[PDB]
Curated annotation (Swiss-Prot), chain A:
It comes from Epstein-Barr virus (strain B95-8). Homomultimer. Makes the hexons and eleven out of twelve pentons. Interacts with triplex proteins 1/TRX1 and 2/TRX2; adjacent capsomers are linked together in groups of three by triplexes, heterotrimeric complexes composed of one molecule of TRX1 and two molecules of TRX2. Interacts with scaffold protein; this interaction allows efficient MCP transport to the host nucleus. Interacts with capsid vertex component 2/CVC2. Interacts with the small capsomere-interacting protein/SCP. It comes from the Viruses. Self-assembles to form an icosahedral capsid with a T=16 symmetry, about 200 nm in diameter, and consisting of 150 hexons and 12 pentons (total of 162 capsomers). Hexons form the edges and faces of the capsid and are each composed of six MCP molecules. In contrast, one penton is found at each of the 12 vertices. Eleven of the pentons are MCP pentamers, while the last vertex is occupied by the portal complex. Signal peptide: none annotated. The chain holds residues 1087 to 1135 of 1381 of the full protein. This is Major capsid protein. Belongs to the herpesviridae major capsid protein family. It is found in: Virion; Host nucleus. The gene is MCP.
Length: 49, 49
């Protein structure tokens, strides 16, 4: 097992990198009509009847 | 190949897997039409100019 150690230091006094989103590859969520169900997150509530 | 991850420390040697693949073979055949009298000239090499 070969252990490699290295050490980094940003010499720039300000930021010196940028991370721009450039391209959407795919949209994972279906962007649909799916309302979350309050009778699943609150199953311990009801009315008087 | 493998990437040396130091963060998780989950060291792993290279995963050499083996698949096998078929070699296709093809067989083309054409014919050459050499006439008889020209081959008879080609066999008897002449000396007359």
């Amino acid at each position: 097992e070969v252990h490699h150690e290295m050490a980094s230091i940003d010499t720039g006094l300000s930021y010196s990198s940028t991370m721009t989103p450039a391209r959407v590859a795919a949209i994972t969520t279906d962007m649909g009509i799916h309302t979350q169900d309050f009778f699943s997150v609150f199953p311990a509530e009801a009315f008087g009847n | 190949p493998t990437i040396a991850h130091g963060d998780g420390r989950r060291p792993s040697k290279q995963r050499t897997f083996i698949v096998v693949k078929n070699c296709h073979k093809h067989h083309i055949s054409t014919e050459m039409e050499l006439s008889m009298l020209d081959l008879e000239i080609l066999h008897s090499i002449p000396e007359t100019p």
